[PDB]
Tab-separated table of C-alpha atoms in Angstrom:
chain	number	residue	atom	x	y	z
P	1	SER	CA	0.289	0.110	0.015
P	2	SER	CA	0.929	3.568	0.382
P	3	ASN	CA	3.771	2.821	2.978
P	4	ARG	CA	3.740	-0.730	3.768
P	5	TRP	CA	4.710	-3.927	2.277
P	6	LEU	CA	2.904	-6.954	3.269
P	7	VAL	CA	4.760	-10.320	2.585
P	8	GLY	CA	3.089	-13.258	0.533
P	9	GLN	CA	5.757	-15.682	1.510
P	10	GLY	CA	8.333	-15.974	4.496
P	11	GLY	CA	11.700	-16.403	3.408
P	12	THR	CA	15.173	-14.985	2.409
P	13	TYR	CA	14.872	-11.539	0.531
P	14	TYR	CA	17.346	-9.312	-1.049
P	15	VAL	CA	16.093	-5.861	0.118
P	16	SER	CA	17.272	-2.775	-1.397
P	17	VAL	CA	16.513	0.952	-0.351
P	18	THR	CA	17.998	4.118	-1.388
P	19	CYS	CA	16.665	7.712	-0.476
P	20	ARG	CA	17.987	11.404	-0.569
P	21	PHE	CA	17.828	13.679	2.289
P	22	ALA	CA	17.873	17.569	1.656
P	23	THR	CA	17.147	20.544	3.242
P	24	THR	CA	14.491	23.363	1.779
P	25	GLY	CA	13.989	27.205	2.801
P	26	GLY	CA	15.891	29.195	4.968
P	27	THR	CA	19.227	29.059	6.583
P	28	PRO	CA	20.699	25.547	5.819
P	29	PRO	CA	22.186	23.866	8.884
P	30	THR	CA	25.552	23.235	9.692
P	31	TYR	CA	25.146	19.082	10.031
P	32	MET	CA	22.853	16.057	10.022
P	33	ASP	CA	23.007	12.638	11.239
P	34	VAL	CA	20.778	10.140	8.914
P	35	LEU	CA	19.756	6.398	9.847
P	36	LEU	CA	17.727	4.137	7.892
P	37	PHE	CA	15.964	1.636	9.485
P	38	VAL	CA	13.555	-1.152	8.550
P	39	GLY	CA	11.066	-2.689	10.922
P	40	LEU	CA	7.671	-4.869	11.796
P	41	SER	CA	6.316	-2.031	13.214
P	42	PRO	CA	5.384	1.783	12.796
P	43	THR	CA	8.164	2.646	15.193
P	44	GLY	CA	10.030	-0.862	14.045
P	45	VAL	CA	13.655	-0.794	14.495
P	46	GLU	CA	14.725	-4.512	14.248
P	47	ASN	CA	17.119	-4.132	11.202
P	48	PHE	CA	19.036	-0.997	11.156
P	49	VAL	CA	21.107	-0.613	7.694
P	50	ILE	CA	23.025	2.579	7.197
P	51	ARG	CA	24.006	5.663	8.959
P	52	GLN	CA	25.638	8.541	7.455
P	53	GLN	CA	26.595	12.355	8.315
C	1	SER	CA	29.455	-0.700	-26.666
C	2	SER	CA	32.545	1.555	-25.277
C	3	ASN	CA	30.315	3.414	-23.169
C	4	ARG	CA	26.604	2.247	-23.719
C	5	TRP	CA	24.179	-0.816	-23.176
C	6	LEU	CA	21.784	-1.860	-26.044
C	7	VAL	CA	18.586	-3.311	-24.424
C	8	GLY	CA	17.765	-6.658	-26.092
C	9	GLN	CA	14.466	-7.015	-24.200
C	10	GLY	CA	12.717	-4.233	-22.154
C	11	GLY	CA	11.538	-4.982	-18.888
C	12	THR	CA	12.860	-4.595	-15.168
C	13	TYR	CA	16.501	-4.484	-14.513
C	14	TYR	CA	18.390	-4.455	-10.975
C	15	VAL	CA	21.354	-2.098	-12.021
C	16	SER	CA	24.315	-1.461	-9.758
C	17	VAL	CA	26.692	1.488	-10.453
C	18	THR	CA	29.912	2.445	-8.439
C	19	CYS	CA	32.592	5.260	-9.462
C	20	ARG	CA	35.189	6.274	-7.367
C	21	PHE	CA	36.198	9.998	-7.653
C	22	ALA	CA	39.551	11.563	-6.333
C	23	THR	CA	42.242	14.089	-7.304
C	24	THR	CA	45.528	13.696	-8.550
C	25	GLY	CA	48.018	16.443	-8.528
C	26	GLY	CA	48.378	20.136	-7.359
C	27	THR	CA	46.616	21.468	-4.434
C	28	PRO	CA	43.680	19.288	-3.514
C	29	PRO	CA	40.362	21.351	-3.264
C	30	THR	CA	38.181	21.988	-0.249
C	31	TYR	CA	34.886	20.367	-1.729
C	32	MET	CA	33.745	17.662	-4.141
C	33	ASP	CA	30.090	17.223	-4.991
C	34	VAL	CA	29.252	14.285	-7.558
C	35	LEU	CA	25.461	13.167	-8.907
C	36	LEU	CA	25.289	10.107	-10.743
C	37	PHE	CA	22.481	9.542	-13.342
C	38	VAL	CA	21.322	6.519	-15.679
C	39	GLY	CA	20.570	8.119	-19.105
C	40	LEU	CA	18.689	7.151	-22.321
C	41	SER	CA	20.965	9.648	-24.051
C	42	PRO	CA	24.598	10.849	-23.597
C	43	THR	CA	23.508	14.134	-21.790
C	44	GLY	CA	20.395	12.061	-20.171
C	45	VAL	CA	19.764	12.661	-16.709
C	46	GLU	CA	16.771	10.480	-16.397
C	47	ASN	CA	17.251	8.273	-13.519
C	48	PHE	CA	19.296	10.323	-10.598
C	49	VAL	CA	20.505	7.572	-8.461
C	50	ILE	CA	22.755	8.992	-5.967
C	51	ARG	CA	24.447	12.418	-5.129
C	52	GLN	CA	27.253	12.493	-2.682
C	53	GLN	CA	30.101	14.922	-1.419
């Protein structure tokens, strides 16, 4: 659906994720830190994949 | 070819790209920013994949 994936058959899956973070409007900040997660919950945090600054 | 792929059959393709950008000679600059695209033309920017710095 618009935000979530319902799995049809459980098993081994090759998951690929990509997303670009930017800033719009005003004075850009001096820094950000970013974490990407995949979860079974709206706050699901079980598979943390990549963090960049 | 030397710089391009001819699609034999249209469909879904899992493509991976990797390019290492560095500097040679002189005084190294203070900043690099590179954007990568998958295009249908030599000047094409149809599928922007990653911008990094």
